[PDB]
From a paper:
Here, we exploit the relience of Mtb on host-derived cholesterol to develop a novel class of antitubercular compounds that target Mtb CYP125 and CYP142; the enzymes that catalyze the first step of cholesterol metabolism. We subsequently employ CYP142 as a structural proxy to guide hit-to-lead optimization of dual CYP125/142 inhibitors that have low nanomolar binding affinity and inhibit CYP125/142 catalytic activity in vitro.
A 1.7 Å X-ray crystal structure of 1a in complex with CYP142 was obtained by soaking fragment solutions into CYP142 crystals that were prepared by sitting-drop vapor diffusion. Interestingly, the structure revealed two molecules of 1a bound per enzyme active site: one coordinated directly to the heme iron via the pyridine-N (1a-i), and the second located near the entrance of the active site channel (1a-ii).
Residue numbers in the entry: 3 to 397
Write the structure that this text describes.
C-alpha cells in the first residue's frame, strides 16, 4: 500500500525514511498523489518531461504548493522570464563568477583559521553555513559584522517558503522583508550615484533591448539571489562532507588525487539535493505518465527522488565520487536551471579542497551518529555536524 505521507509537511523531509517513500512512488505510481491529493513527479523521466513542457507545467502560479506567485524570475514564464533572466545574468557570467575564485578562497581560509587550533568544530555552524553567506554578502555590500543579521532574515524567509506559517511567523517574515527592502534600496541609490563593481552596480547597469531592471525588480531579484546564496549550498557542503567522512575510502581517494574533486562535487550535489521540490501549475488537464492531472492544480518536482532513480543512477544509495555520468537534477533542468549553479559549484570546490588539505584527519565525533535534518518542505539539510581533527596553526 502507498506510504501515508504529506509532501507539504516539513517533517517528511527531515525523515530518513523519505527515500523509502520515494522508492515506492517510483515503482508503483511515478506521478504520485499524497494523502491530501497533492501531485508529485517522483521519477527522473517525469521530472525531465515536465521541465521540458513549460507551457503545460508553468511557474507563473508560484513555485510553492500553498502560496501565490511573487514578482521574480523563478515565478515567471517565457518570454517575460527570459528577459528578466538575461538582465540578471549580467551578474553571473562565466567570467565574472570564475573571477571570484581568489576572494572565495580567502574566505575559506579565514573560516578554517578560526577553528583549526581547536581540534573540534561544528562543521555546519563554523564552515558550511558561513562561507556561502560571506560570499553572497560581500557581493551585496554587507559588512562582515552584519552577516548574521542577513542570515537570520534569510532563515525566516526560507522558513516561510518551507511551511505554512502562523500569524506571528508571518509578521516576522514581513518584518524581515521590510528590513531587506530598506537596506537594498539604500544600496541601489548609492550605486546609482557612485557605481562600483559589486552586484547591485552590475545589475543597475544591465540592459537588454532597451530594457533595464526597475528598483522593485532589483529588490526582488537580489533577494532571490541572497537566499540562493545563503540557504542552499550550505547543505551540500555539510551533507556532502558527511558522506566523505562516513565512507572513508571516498575521503582517502580525494586526498590522494585532487583531479577527482569535480566529480566529487557533483556526487555531493546529487546526494544532498538541498532543494527538495519546486512546484508547477497545470495550464490544462493532462494525462501525465499514467496520472490524470487537472488544470490549475500544482505538481511538485521531487528532485531528491529523481537523483536516486535507479533508472538513471546505478546503485543510487552508493555514494561514489567517481560516478560518471552524473546528470543529477539538484539544480533542476531547462528554462529555470539554477542561475547560481556555477557560483555554488565554485564555493563547494574551494572549501572542500581546503578542508581536505588543512583538516586531513577530519572525522565525525560519533561515526555512528544519526544527525538531525531541518524540518522544512522546500530546502533542507543538516542542523549540526560535530567534527574533530588534529589542530594546526592558522595561515
Ligand atoms: C547548491 C546550491 C543550489 C541549489 C541546489 C539550487 C537549486 C535551484 C533550483 C532547483 C532551481 C529551479 C530549477 C528548476 O525548477 O528547474 C534554482 C533556481 C535559481 N537559483 Fe538556485 N540553487 C542553488 C544555489 C543558488 C545560488 C548560489 C544562487 C545565486 C547566487 C541561485 C540563484 C538562483 C536563481 C536566480 C534561480 C532562478 C532561475 C530562473 O528562474 O530562471 N541559486 N536553483
Ligand atoms: C513576501 C515575503 C517573501 C519574499 C520573498 N521570499 C519569501 C517571502
Ligand atoms: C523564492 C524562490 C526560491 C528561493 C530559494 C532558492 C533560490 C535559488 N536557488 C534555489 C533556491 C527563494 C525565494
Amino acid at each position: 500500500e502507498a506510504p501515508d505521507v504529506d509532501l507539504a509537511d516539513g517533517n517528511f523531509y527531515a525523515s530518513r525514511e523519505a527515500r523509502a517513500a520515494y522508492r515506492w512512488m517510483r515503482a508503483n505510481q511515478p506521478v504520485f498523489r499524497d494523502r491530501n491529493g497533492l501531485a508529485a513527479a517522483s521519477t527522473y523521466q517525469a521530472v525531465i518531461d515536465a521541465e521540458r513542457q513549460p507551457e503545460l507545467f508553468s511557474n507563473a502560479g508560484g513555485i510553492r504548493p500553498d502560496q501565490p506567485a511573487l514578482p521574480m524570475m523563478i515565478d515567471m514564464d517565457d518570454p517575460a522570464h527570459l528577459l528578466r533572466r538575461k538582465l540578471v545574468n549580467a551578474g553571473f557570467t562565466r567570467k565574472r563568477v570564475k573571477d571570484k575564485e581568489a576572494s572565495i578562497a580567502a574566505l575559506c581560509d579565514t573560516l578554517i583559521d578560526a577553528v583549526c587550533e581547536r581540534g573540534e568544530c561544528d562543521f555546519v555552524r563554523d564552515l558550511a553555513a558561513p562561507l556561502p553567506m560571506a560570499v553572497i554578502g560581500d557581493m551585496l555590500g554587507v559588512r562582515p559584522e552584519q552577516r548574521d543579521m542577513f542570515l537570520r532574515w534569510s532563515d525566516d524567509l526560507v522558513t516561510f517558503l518551507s511551511s505554512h506559517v502562523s500569524q506571528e511567523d508571518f509578521q516576522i517574515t514581513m518584518d524581515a522583508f521590510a528590513a531587506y527592502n530598506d537596506f537594498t534600496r539604500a544600496t541601489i541609490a548609492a550605486r546609482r550615484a557612485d557605481p562600483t563593481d559589486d552586484l547591485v552596480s552590475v545589475l543597475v547597469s544591465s540592459e537588454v533591448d532597451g530594457e533595464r531592471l526597475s528598483d522593485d525588480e532589483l529588490v526582488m531579484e537580489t533577494l532571490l539571489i541572497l537566499i540562493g546564496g545563503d540557504e542552499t549550498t550550505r547543505h551540500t557542503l555539510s551533507g556532502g562532507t558527511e558522506q566523505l567522512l562516513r565512507n572513508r575510502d571516498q575521503w582517502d581517494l580525494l586526498q590522494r588525487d585532487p583531479s577527482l574533486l569535480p566529480g566529487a562535487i557533483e556526487e555531493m550535489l546529487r546526494w544532498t539535493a538541498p532543494v527538495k521540490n519546486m512546484c508547477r501549475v497545470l495550464t490544462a488537464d493532462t494525462e501525465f505518465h499514467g496520472t490524470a492531472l487537472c488544470a490549475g492544480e500544482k505538481m511538485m518536482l521531487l528532485f531528491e527522488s529523481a537523483n536516486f532513480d535507479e533508472a538513471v543512477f546505478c546503485e543510487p544509495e552508493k555514494f561514489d565520487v567517481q560516478r560518471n555520468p552524473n546528470s543529477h537534477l539538484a539544480f533542476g533542468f531547462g528554462t529555470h536551471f539554477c542561475l547560481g549553479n556555477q557560483l555554488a559549484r565554485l564555493e563547494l570546490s574551494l572549501m572542500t579542497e581546503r578542508v581536505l588539505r588543512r583538516l586531513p584527519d577530519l572525522r565525525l565525533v560519533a561515526d555512528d551518529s544519526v544527525l538531525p535534518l531541518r524540518p522544512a518542505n522546500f530546502v533542507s539539510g543538516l542542523e549540526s555536524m560535530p567534527v574533530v581533527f588534529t589542530p594546526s596553526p592558522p595561515l
